[PDB]
Amino acid sequence: TDPALRAIIERCRELALRAPARVVFPDALDQRVLKAAQYLHQQGLATPILVANPFELRQFALSHGVAMDGLQVIDPHGNLAMREEFAHRWLARAGEKTPPDALEKLTDPLMFAAAMVSAGKADVCIAGNLSSTANVLRAGLRIIGLQPGCKTLSSIFLMLPQYSGPALGFADCSVVPQPTAAQLADIALASAETWRAITGEEPRVAMLSFSSNGSARHPCVANVQQATEIVRERAPKLVVDGELQFDAAFVPEVAAQKAPASPLQGKANVMVFPSLEAGNIGYKIAQRLGGYRAVGPLIQGLAAPMHDLSRGCSVQEIIELALVAAVPR
Amino acid sequence: TDPALRAIIERCRELALRAPARVVFPDALDQRVLKAAQYLHQQGLATPILVANPFELRQFALSHGVAMDGLQVIDPHGNLAMREEFAHRWLARAGEKTPPDALEKLTDPLMFAAAMVSAGKADVCIAGNLSSTANVLRAGLRIIGLQPGCKTLSSIFLMLPQYSGPALGFADCSVVPQPTAAQLADIALASAETWRAITGEEPRVAMLSFSSNGSARHPCVANVQQATEIVRERAPKLVVDGELQFDAAFVPEVAAQKAPASPLQGKANVMVFPSLEAGNIGYKIAQRLGGYRAVGPLIQGLAAPMHDLSRGCSVQEIIELALVAAVPR
């Protein structure tokens, strides 16, 4: 029933009915990635690209029993012509901040994959199944860079109900520990953008706190109020409301009591948590007590898509992250 | 199946099979309270005591159509003999900090009710259906005082599954905005005490964060680590583990990966949130997405029970708060 869930599911269906997104995987020496890749290919859901030495990977894959059939492999220590083009695009963008030995730094698979995405030789980078989160985010920031107007890298989970309910987007549950009011607005605004791009629905953003309207008064509350004002000036046609408790944001009967003038009317589909504690704990409560599947998260704030998996991810998590990452078109 | 839920439900059943707890209601001029009171009486689940002028209350109740039959009413502007005894008990406890006109301050229904509980003329005070939370907590602190060894007033929700699942205790989701490590330990230790008293089960306490083991490093994380060390020194036979993410605390397969030496083994029944943001948002996610009923919350840290309802509470919320508040025996 929720048009946002309907739209997500059907948009992933339809990946097979249009030209495939090229999804680059730099942590390729991982049987989960090989399996995810082979599935994507077999189902015509995407064009996977594995970043590795093809001799090393072939030996790897043969020893783990995974079918390599039809999968593009690209060696980041070869492809000098390409790495020269990436070095040049990096210089042009980053300027004085461009390392020398850029050419060598680009032989790192994460960097090479980031540079492909940045240059449009791939559409999406998915990494982090082997590489540390710090490394994956560092590569993305260095090679892809921030989105213009966004000074903050954040993440958003797509919360998809198993049992029954709405799809929601839960942000920042992974990256920024204690957002400033300006960061919180960066997160809000990026989340809206991500939500629209994936779902086709118009974001209805709630800035969460322990207060609704000014029901409480504390520096915590003010940071969220400040963020809300910033969001409204930056994006004056966004549907948003701020400091709201979860129930005021999500339950129309409660919004009626606690926040009657609220333009969300208790129908927020995007929740912006005030801190990593609240977000990280909260989406996990949503998944474990609520039966929600938490897809991703999707990294946001970058000029092009590069996402970070958990080192402990499953094959299925990789697949579903690739699918939602590929939908924005 | 969960022995803690089984025990809660059956202990509320059995309230009718033993001598009733005297539950005092100082916000008596409220038809919800009159209804809750009359139900408790009719079901022999408790002995309600209404604090009000009996002429005023009789007129009130007659005009709202609520049956007053068999309900004790006590006038806080009368009962000088009693108020003198309360004044004297207050002087003995508080000493130099005892107001003059104590005798007059005790004619305030909240104060009179707090003084009855403190003196054992009642077992439990339930207030806040009309009075502000600040007023209810202020009365309790002034007349009842803190529990010895506890320097912090906090609250705990009993999270009871509708659909299926374990009962859990979620603390501080209402009172303390940003607990210090020492406050967080006060909250932990009081929560355990509350949990044992209500359920009969032995508390298994998780100190929640966005990190599990030292998976992250941030002042936020350290505050929870510090709290955990304090809890362990203060209560060396408590089952507790600290900084854990929600999933590491609650999901044995996850605890195995993220925190293998954890003595919770992913079977925490008491979660101590690191902040009001996280707790307030979190229990609301648990109720709204998870189908949990959030009973209370129960105020803790006081020398005797005085609890605070929402001004917007339902009759049923009052009843169920009275019932769980009455179980500890």
GROMACS .gro file of C-alpha atoms in nm, chain B:
model
  329
  330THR     CA    1   0.722  -1.764   2.671
  331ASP     CA    2   0.943  -1.484   2.810
  332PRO     CA    3   0.949  -1.548   3.189
  333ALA     CA    4   0.964  -1.174   3.252
  334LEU     CA    5   0.642  -1.105   3.059
  335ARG     CA    6   0.475  -1.411   3.208
  336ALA     CA    7   0.574  -1.290   3.552
  337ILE     CA    8   0.449  -0.932   3.498
  338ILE     CA    9   0.107  -1.034   3.372
  339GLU     CA   10   0.055  -1.298   3.639
  340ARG     CA   11   0.179  -1.067   3.915
  341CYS     CA   12  -0.085  -0.812   3.810
  342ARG     CA   13  -0.345  -1.090   3.811
  343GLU     CA   14  -0.244  -1.178   4.167
  344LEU     CA   15  -0.283  -0.825   4.298
  345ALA     CA   16  -0.645  -0.931   4.354
  346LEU     CA   17  -0.540  -1.235   4.562
  347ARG     CA   18  -0.343  -1.048   4.829
  348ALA     CA   19  -0.398  -0.735   5.039
  349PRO     CA   20  -0.440  -0.426   4.824
  350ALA     CA   21  -0.175  -0.159   4.777
  351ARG     CA   22  -0.294   0.185   4.878
  352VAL     CA   23  -0.244   0.404   4.572
  353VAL     CA   24  -0.280   0.778   4.632
  354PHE     CA   25  -0.396   1.011   4.348
  355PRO     CA   26  -0.341   1.383   4.414
  356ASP     CA   27  -0.469   1.506   4.072
  357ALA     CA   28  -0.815   1.376   4.167
  358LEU     CA   29  -1.034   1.632   3.991
  359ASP     CA   30  -0.997   1.446   3.669
  360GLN     CA   31  -1.256   1.208   3.540
  361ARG     CA   32  -0.989   0.970   3.406
  362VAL     CA   33  -0.847   0.931   3.756
  363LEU     CA   34  -1.195   0.880   3.903
  364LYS     CA   35  -1.262   0.613   3.642
  365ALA     CA   36  -0.923   0.444   3.692
  366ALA     CA   37  -0.983   0.456   4.070
  367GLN     CA   38  -1.331   0.313   4.051
  368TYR     CA   39  -1.206   0.027   3.827
  369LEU     CA   40  -0.919  -0.055   4.064
  370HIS     CA   41  -1.163  -0.067   4.353
  371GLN     CA   42  -1.425  -0.268   4.174
  372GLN     CA   43  -1.167  -0.521   4.063
  373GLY     CA   44  -1.010  -0.536   4.413
  374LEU     CA   45  -0.673  -0.463   4.250
  375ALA     CA   46  -0.586  -0.171   4.477
  376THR     CA   47  -0.714   0.071   4.741
  377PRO     CA   48  -0.730   0.411   4.568
  378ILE     CA   49  -0.707   0.727   4.775
  379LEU     CA   50  -0.815   1.056   4.622
  380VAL     CA   51  -0.660   1.378   4.760
  381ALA     CA   52  -0.921   1.658   4.737
  382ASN     CA   53  -1.192   1.844   4.916
  383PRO     CA   54  -1.468   1.584   4.942
  384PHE     CA   55  -1.741   1.842   4.871
  385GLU     CA   56  -1.561   1.968   4.564
  386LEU     CA   57  -1.487   1.618   4.436
  387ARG     CA   58  -1.840   1.492   4.500
  388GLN     CA   59  -1.977   1.782   4.288
  389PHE     CA   60  -1.708   1.714   4.023
  390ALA     CA   61  -1.786   1.344   4.005
  391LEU     CA   62  -2.161   1.395   4.002
  392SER     CA   63  -2.123   1.635   3.708
  393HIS     CA   64  -1.898   1.395   3.509
  394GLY     CA   65  -2.118   1.092   3.587
  395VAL     CA   66  -1.855   0.881   3.767
  396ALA     CA   67  -1.937   0.645   4.052
  397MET     CA   68  -1.767   0.749   4.378
  398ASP     CA   69  -1.887   0.438   4.563
  399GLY     CA   70  -1.634   0.291   4.804
  400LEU     CA   71  -1.349   0.540   4.726
  401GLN     CA   72  -1.152   0.698   5.006
  402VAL     CA   73  -1.118   1.076   4.978
  403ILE     CA   74  -0.879   1.274   5.199
  404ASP     CA   75  -0.872   1.655   5.227
  405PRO     CA   76  -0.514   1.796   5.232
  406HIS     CA   77  -0.641   2.126   5.374
  407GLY     CA   78  -0.790   1.934   5.665
  408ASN     CA   79  -0.606   1.659   5.847
  409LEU     CA   80  -0.391   1.895   6.058
  410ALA     CA   81  -0.299   1.608   6.289
  411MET     CA   82  -0.163   1.425   5.986
  412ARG     CA   83  -0.001   1.728   5.830
  413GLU     CA   84   0.173   1.798   6.165
  414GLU     CA   85   0.314   1.445   6.160
  415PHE     CA   86   0.425   1.501   5.795
  416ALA     CA   87   0.580   1.836   5.885
  417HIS     CA   88   0.769   1.665   6.169
  418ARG     CA   89   0.892   1.376   5.948
  419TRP     CA   90   1.002   1.633   5.692
  420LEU     CA   91   1.195   1.836   5.951
  421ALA     CA   92   1.370   1.525   6.084
  422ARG     CA   93   1.479   1.425   5.732
  423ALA     CA   94   1.555   1.753   5.561
  424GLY     CA   95   1.673   1.954   5.857
  425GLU     CA   96   1.790   2.307   5.775
  426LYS     CA   97   1.645   2.258   5.425
  427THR     CA   98   1.292   2.234   5.574
  428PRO     CA   99   1.075   2.533   5.473
  429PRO     CA  100   0.885   2.713   5.736
  430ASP     CA  101   0.515   2.705   5.659
  431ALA     CA  102   0.587   2.333   5.590
  432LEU     CA  103   0.240   2.283   5.742
  433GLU     CA  104   0.092   2.500   5.463
  434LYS     CA  105   0.303   2.358   5.182
  435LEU     CA  106   0.169   2.014   5.282
  436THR     CA  107  -0.186   2.125   5.199
  437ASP     CA  108  -0.080   2.110   4.834
  438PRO     CA  109  -0.225   1.777   4.714
  439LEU     CA  110   0.102   1.663   4.552
  440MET     CA  111   0.291   1.728   4.869
  441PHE     CA  112   0.028   1.574   5.093
  442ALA     CA  113   0.029   1.261   4.868
  443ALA     CA  114   0.407   1.246   4.864
  444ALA     CA  115   0.409   1.275   5.247
  445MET     CA  116   0.159   0.994   5.285
  446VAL     CA  117   0.377   0.765   5.076
  447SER     CA  118   0.692   0.872   5.258
  448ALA     CA  119   0.523   0.801   5.594
  449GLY     CA  120   0.375   0.472   5.477
  450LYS     CA  121   0.013   0.594   5.492
  451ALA     CA  122   0.010   0.505   5.122
  452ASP     CA  123   0.227   0.266   4.919
  453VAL     CA  124   0.230   0.444   4.585
  454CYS     CA  125   0.164   0.794   4.456
  455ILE     CA  126   0.044   0.836   4.099
  456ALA     CA  127   0.020   1.195   3.975
  457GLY     CA  128   0.074   1.407   3.665
  458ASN     CA  129  -0.256   1.370   3.486
  459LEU     CA  130  -0.322   1.740   3.576
  460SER     CA  131   0.006   1.858   3.740
  461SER     CA  132   0.320   1.941   3.540
  462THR     CA  133   0.601   1.688   3.539
  463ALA     CA  134   0.830   1.947   3.702
  464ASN     CA  135   0.583   1.982   3.987
  465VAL     CA  136   0.536   1.608   4.034
  466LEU     CA  137   0.909   1.537   4.042
  467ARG     CA  138   0.980   1.837   4.262
  468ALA     CA  139   0.719   1.717   4.517
  469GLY     CA  140   0.868   1.367   4.522
  470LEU     CA  141   1.225   1.492   4.564
  471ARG     CA  142   1.127   1.732   4.841
  472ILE     CA  143   0.898   1.513   5.049
  473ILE     CA  144   1.017   1.158   4.970
  474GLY     CA  145   1.383   1.237   4.881
  475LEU     CA  146   1.638   1.029   4.692
  476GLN     CA  147   1.710   0.662   4.763
  477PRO     CA  148   2.028   0.635   4.969
  478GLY     CA  149   2.326   0.583   4.735
  479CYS     CA  150   2.128   0.717   4.440
  480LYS     CA  151   2.205   1.077   4.343
  481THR     CA  152   1.985   1.076   4.026
  482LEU     CA  153   1.614   1.066   3.952
  483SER     CA  154   1.538   0.867   3.635
  484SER     CA  155   1.258   0.670   3.470
  485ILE     CA  156   1.207   0.326   3.311
  486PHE     CA  157   0.949   0.206   3.066
  487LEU     CA  158   0.829  -0.148   3.075
  488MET     CA  159   0.817  -0.246   2.714
  489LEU     CA  160   0.559  -0.521   2.672
  490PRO     CA  161   0.514  -0.689   2.334
  491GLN     CA  162   0.167  -0.709   2.183
  492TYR     CA  163   0.260  -0.931   1.888
  493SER     CA  164   0.531  -1.167   2.035
  494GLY     CA  165   0.871  -1.115   2.202
  495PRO     CA  166   1.045  -1.034   2.529
  496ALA     CA  167   0.955  -0.779   2.787
  497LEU     CA  168   1.229  -0.522   2.816
  498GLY     CA  169   1.300  -0.225   3.033
  499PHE     CA  170   1.402   0.095   2.855
  500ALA     CA  171   1.572   0.363   3.066
  501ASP     CA  172   1.606   0.690   3.086
  502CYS     CA  173   1.362   0.780   2.808
  503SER     CA  174   1.202   1.074   2.997
  504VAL     CA  175   1.401   1.259   3.261
  505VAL     CA  176   1.780   1.306   3.232
  506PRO     CA  177   1.880   1.478   2.901
  507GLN     CA  178   2.255   1.400   2.890
  508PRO     CA  179   2.358   1.172   3.178
  509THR     CA  180   2.713   1.191   3.311
  510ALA     CA  181   2.891   0.856   3.346
  511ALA     CA  182   2.790   0.860   3.715
  512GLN     CA  183   2.426   0.946   3.637
  513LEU     CA  184   2.418   0.678   3.370
  514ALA     CA  185   2.534   0.430   3.639
  515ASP     CA  186   2.269   0.562   3.881
  516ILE     CA  187   2.016   0.495   3.604
  517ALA     CA  188   2.155   0.151   3.524
  518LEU     CA  189   2.156   0.040   3.886
  519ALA     CA  190   1.809   0.177   3.965
  520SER     CA  191   1.673   0.019   3.649
  521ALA     CA  192   1.806  -0.320   3.751
  522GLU     CA  193   1.643  -0.275   4.090
  523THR     CA  194   1.311  -0.176   3.934
  524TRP     CA  195   1.327  -0.461   3.686
  525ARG     CA  196   1.393  -0.729   3.954
  526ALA     CA  197   1.120  -0.586   4.181
  527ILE     CA  198   0.853  -0.588   3.911
  528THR     CA  199   0.941  -0.907   3.723
  529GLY     CA  200   1.122  -1.137   3.967
  530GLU     CA  201   1.377  -1.192   3.688
  531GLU     CA  202   1.739  -1.110   3.731
  532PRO     CA  203   1.835  -0.804   3.536
  533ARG     CA  204   2.067  -0.833   3.239
  534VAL     CA  205   2.175  -0.478   3.172
  535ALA     CA  206   2.313  -0.340   2.847
  536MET     CA  207   2.475   0.001   2.825
  537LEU     CA  208   2.386   0.114   2.479
  538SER     CA  209   2.596   0.316   2.235
  539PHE     CA  210   2.671   0.335   1.862
  540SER     CA  211   2.988   0.126   1.932
  541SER     CA  212   3.023  -0.240   2.046
  542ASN     CA  213   3.343  -0.344   2.221
  543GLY     CA  214   3.569  -0.057   2.111
  544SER     CA  215   3.437  -0.068   1.750
  545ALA     CA  216   3.426   0.311   1.766
  546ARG     CA  217   3.625   0.571   1.957
  547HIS     CA  218   3.453   0.900   2.060
  548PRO     CA  219   3.382   1.090   2.388
  549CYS     CA  220   3.019   0.961   2.359
  550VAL     CA  221   3.145   0.605   2.367
  551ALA     CA  222   3.381   0.673   2.660
  552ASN     CA  223   3.099   0.813   2.879
  553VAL     CA  224   2.916   0.480   2.840
  554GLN     CA  225   3.239   0.281   2.902
  555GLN     CA  226   3.302   0.485   3.216
  556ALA     CA  227   2.947   0.424   3.333
  557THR     CA  228   2.989   0.050   3.279
  558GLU     CA  229   3.308   0.042   3.492
  559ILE     CA  230   3.128   0.233   3.767
  560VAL     CA  231   2.832  -0.007   3.755
  561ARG     CA  232   3.063  -0.307   3.786
  562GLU     CA  233   3.248  -0.169   4.092
  563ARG     CA  234   2.924  -0.063   4.262
  564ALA     CA  235   2.741  -0.388   4.183
  565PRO     CA  236   2.998  -0.660   4.112
  566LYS     CA  237   2.743  -0.941   4.080
  567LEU     CA  238   2.511  -0.755   3.842
  568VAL     CA  239   2.501  -0.904   3.491
  569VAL     CA  240   2.597  -0.612   3.273
  570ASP     CA  241   2.797  -0.524   2.965
  571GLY     CA  242   2.881  -0.192   2.814
  572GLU     CA  243   2.911  -0.011   2.516
  573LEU     CA  244   2.707  -0.239   2.306
  574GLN     CA  245   2.495  -0.153   2.008
  575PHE     CA  246   2.130  -0.256   2.037
  576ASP     CA  247   2.181  -0.561   1.812
  577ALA     CA  248   2.488  -0.682   2.013
  578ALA     CA  249   2.284  -0.649   2.336
  579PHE     CA  250   1.968  -0.816   2.212
  580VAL     CA  251   2.066  -1.070   1.937
  581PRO     CA  252   2.283  -1.364   2.042
  582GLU     CA  253   2.412  -1.432   1.687
  583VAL     CA  254   2.528  -1.066   1.665
  584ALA     CA  255   2.676  -1.059   2.015
  585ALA     CA  256   2.881  -1.360   1.905
  586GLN     CA  257   3.046  -1.156   1.626
  587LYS     CA  258   3.065  -0.803   1.774
  588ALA     CA  259   3.120  -0.889   2.144
  589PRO     CA  260   3.216  -1.258   2.197
  590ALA     CA  261   3.324  -1.224   2.564
  591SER     CA  262   2.998  -1.039   2.651
  592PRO     CA  263   2.829  -1.181   2.963
  593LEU     CA  264   2.489  -1.071   2.823
  594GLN     CA  265   2.528  -1.316   2.530
  595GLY     CA  266   2.280  -1.100   2.343
  596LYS     CA  267   2.010  -1.159   2.606
  597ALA     CA  268   1.974  -0.817   2.769
  598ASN     CA  269   1.634  -0.743   2.917
  599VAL     CA  270   1.727  -0.394   3.049
  600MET     CA  271   1.859  -0.130   2.806
  601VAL     CA  272   2.021   0.182   2.931
  602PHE     CA  273   2.023   0.445   2.665
  603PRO     CA  274   2.308   0.694   2.656
  604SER     CA  275   2.092   1.008   2.620
  605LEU     CA  276   1.732   1.135   2.630
  606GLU     CA  277   1.736   1.178   2.251
  607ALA     CA  278   1.826   0.814   2.202
  608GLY     CA  279   1.592   0.682   2.470
  609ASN     CA  280   1.293   0.900   2.395
  610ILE     CA  281   1.312   0.838   2.021
  611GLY     CA  282   1.394   0.471   2.078
  612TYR     CA  283   1.108   0.352   2.299
  613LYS     CA  284   0.873   0.542   2.063
  614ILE     CA  285   1.017   0.352   1.767
  615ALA     CA  286   0.974   0.034   1.973
  616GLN     CA  287   0.606   0.119   2.039
  617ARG     CA  288   0.514   0.255   1.694
  618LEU     CA  289   0.712   0.030   1.458
  619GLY     CA  290   0.759  -0.263   1.698
  620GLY     CA  291   0.407  -0.296   1.840
  621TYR     CA  292   0.529  -0.260   2.197
  622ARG     CA  293   0.319  -0.120   2.474
  623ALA     CA  294   0.526   0.124   2.680
  624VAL     CA  295   0.405   0.106   3.040
  625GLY     CA  296   0.473   0.409   3.253
  626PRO     CA  297   0.732   0.524   3.275
  627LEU     CA  298   0.812   0.434   3.631
  628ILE     CA  299   1.006   0.702   3.820
  629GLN     CA  300   1.308   0.560   4.003
  630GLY     CA  301   1.578   0.693   4.235
  631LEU     CA  302   1.334   0.797   4.507
  632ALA     CA  303   1.307   0.647   4.857
  633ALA     CA  304   0.943   0.544   4.783
  634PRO     CA  305   0.717   0.524   4.475
  635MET     CA  306   0.580   0.840   4.319
  636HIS     CA  307   0.516   0.822   3.948
  637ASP     CA  308   0.435   1.086   3.682
  638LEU     CA  309   0.167   1.036   3.414
  639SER     CA  310   0.134   1.241   3.099
  640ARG     CA  311  -0.129   1.512   3.119
  641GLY     CA  312  -0.269   1.352   2.806
  642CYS     CA  313  -0.282   0.997   2.945
  643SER     CA  314  -0.577   0.761   2.898
  644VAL     CA  315  -0.772   0.584   3.171
  645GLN     CA  316  -0.604   0.261   3.067
  646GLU     CA  317  -0.255   0.407   3.101
  647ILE     CA  318  -0.336   0.515   3.456
  648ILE     CA  319  -0.472   0.170   3.540
  649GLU     CA  320  -0.173  -0.016   3.404
  650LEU     CA  321   0.077   0.217   3.568
  651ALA     CA  322  -0.102   0.167   3.904
  652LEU     CA  323  -0.090  -0.208   3.856
  653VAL     CA  324   0.280  -0.240   3.781
  654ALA     CA  325   0.359   0.025   4.042
  655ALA     CA  326   0.174  -0.191   4.301
  656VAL     CA  327   0.341  -0.522   4.225
  657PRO     CA  328   0.673  -0.461   4.413
  658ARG     CA  329   0.591  -0.608   4.760
   0.00000   0.00000   0.00000
